[PDB]
From Swiss-Prot:
Compartments in which it is found: Nucleus; Cytoplasm, Perinuclear region; Membrane
Catalytic site: R137 (proton acceptor)
Post-translational modification: PAK-2p34 is myristoylated.
Encoding gene, per UniProt annotation: PAK2
Protein name: PAK-2p34
Residues with PTM Phosphothreonine: E168
Amino acid sequence: EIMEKLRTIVSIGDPKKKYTRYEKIGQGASGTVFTATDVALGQEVAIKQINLQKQPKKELIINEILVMKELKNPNIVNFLDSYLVGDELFVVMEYLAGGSLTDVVTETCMDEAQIAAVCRECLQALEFLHANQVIHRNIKSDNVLLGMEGSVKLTDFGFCPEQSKRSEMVGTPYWMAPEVVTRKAYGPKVDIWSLGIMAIEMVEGEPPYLNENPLRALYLIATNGTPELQNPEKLSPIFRDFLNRCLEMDVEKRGSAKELLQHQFLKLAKPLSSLTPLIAAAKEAMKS
Ligand SMILES: N[C@H]1CC[C@@H](CNc2nccc(Nc3ncc(C(F)(F)F)s3)n2)CC1
C-alpha cells in the first residue's frame, strides 16, 4: 500500500533541507524527538521522527496526526507541518524555549498570583481539549512548558497507559483521579482532578504520595482523594476553595474546565511575563 491520506498532512520537500542543526532531545516508544532550526524563518522546532515500518498496524490510527493538524490552540504545543522520507514521517511541532513546570517548581517558589496564571492557561487548554472530546490524562508538572516570553503550554497527550493487572506497580500515579484509579468509566473532569494535584505541587514543591508506596497511594486516592495539605492556613481561602472545586471526589460536584475559568482565584493572576524570572532562576540553579 501507498498509505493514502498521507497526502492530507505531508508537505512536499526534504525535512533535512527545510530544517538544520538537528539535535536529539528524546528517544521514546516509537519516536525520536529532535530540536532543529527552520532554514527560512529561523524558528526553532521540535521534530518527531517516526518509522512507520515499525508501526504495528497503527497506520490510520497514527494519522491522529491529522487530528493534531485540525486541533490547534495557543495553550498546547501545536502541529506545524509534516514531511516524509521513505517510511520516516517527520512531524514538526512548536518548540517553546523555557523550562518545564517541574523544573521551576523544584528550584523556585511561586506565589499565588503566578500559580493563578498557570492554572488559567492550563484551564484554557483543557477547555479546548474537552470541547473537542479529548481527555489529556497526564496533566502533570512534566507536561507543562513555560516559555521565556511567558507562554504556558500543555504537552504529551493523545487519544485518537493501560497496565496488565498481573504487573507490579513501580511508579506512583499521583496525578490520577479517584474514578480512574478504581478503573471506573471516566470523563474529562479527571483532567481537572490532576490540575488540582498539580496546583498542590506548585505550592508544596512536590507531588503528593512521594513518601508512599504505589499501592498505598492508590488506596489513598480512592478512599480520601483530596491529598490534604501540609499547612492549610498558608493558603488564601480563595485558593483552597479553588483546590476544593478541582479535588471534589464526586465527579458531578467537581468543576468543569469552563466553570473554573470563572472562579475568583484566577483573578489573582499576574501577567504571564511574571513567569519569566521563574525560568531564569530555574536555568541558573540547574547549571550543575
Ligand atoms: N513531556 C515533557 C515535555 C517536553 C520536555 C522536553 N524538554 C524541554 N525543555 C525546555 C524547553 C522545551 N520546549 C519544548 N517545546 C516543544 C517540545 C516538544 F514538542 F518536544 F515536546 S519540548 N522542552 C520533557 C518531558
